[PDB]
Amino acid sequence: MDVNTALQEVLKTALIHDGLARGIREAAKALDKRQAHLCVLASNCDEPMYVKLVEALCAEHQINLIKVDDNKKLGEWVGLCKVVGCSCVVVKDYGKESQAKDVIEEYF
RNA sequence: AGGAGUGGAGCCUGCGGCUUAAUUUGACCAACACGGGAAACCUCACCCGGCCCGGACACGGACAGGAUUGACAGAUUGAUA
Ligand SMILES: [K+]
Numbered sequence: 001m002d003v004n005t006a007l008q009e010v011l012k013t014a015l016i017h018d019g020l021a022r023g024i025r026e027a028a029k030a031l032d033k034r035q036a037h038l039c040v041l042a043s044n045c046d047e048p049m050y051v052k053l054v055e056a057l058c059a060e061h062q063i064n065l066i067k068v069d070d071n072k073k074l075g076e077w078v079g080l081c082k083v084v085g086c087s088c089v090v091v092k093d094y095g096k097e098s099q100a101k102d103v104i105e106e107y108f
Numbered sequence: 109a110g111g112a113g114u115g116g117a118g119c120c121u122g123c124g125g126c127u128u129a130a131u132u133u134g135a136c137c138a139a140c141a142c143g144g145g146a147a148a149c150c151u152c153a154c155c156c157g158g159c160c161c162g163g164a165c166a167c168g169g170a171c172a173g174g175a176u177u178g179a180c181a182g183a184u185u186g187a188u189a
Pocket residue numbers: 114
């Protein structure tokens with residue numbers, strides 16, 4: 001039960017329950033709205049202001065953050081599949097509690 | 109054999125012609141108050157001008173580092189499209 005597998009399962013559940021906000025604009029709106037318990041970041045993105053703003057907003061809202069490696073893999077996980085490639089995700093809510101969610105909380 | 113008429117008058121209404129941006133069009137005993145057709149808009153088919161897609165689905169491309177949607181004001185417009 002690796003943290004990668006836990007993230008994949010929780011993202012799949014959130015998408016199936018429509019609790020996922022993909023993209024930097026949607027993620028920023030969800031974070032500023034005092035919602036969206038968790039956030040996922042991709043280390044592949046080459047834009048420095050991107051990661052700077054993502055981390056600054058996440059820290060200001062005081063919510064968990066995860067830095068995954070590949071933007072394309074993150075997009076394929078969040079369900080943009082040819083994969084567009086998501087470089088920042090937000091979990092507005094989880095559909096149902098699961099062992100993957102528990103593992104993510106423990107990693108937090 | 110007759111009665112009431114029509115054809116004459118004014119008007120209503122349909123048809124041709126003429127005119128027009130358009131005067132939408134069908135029909136010439138068995139067409140012409142016929143299309144149940146008494147049209148201000150709609151009807152609308154015609155003319156002038158301006159929005160919209162309400163172009164399914166398939167394939168390909170562009171895309172969450174955003175494909176795309178809508179919009180306040182001021183110009184613009186017949187118009188608060
Ligand atoms: K007469």
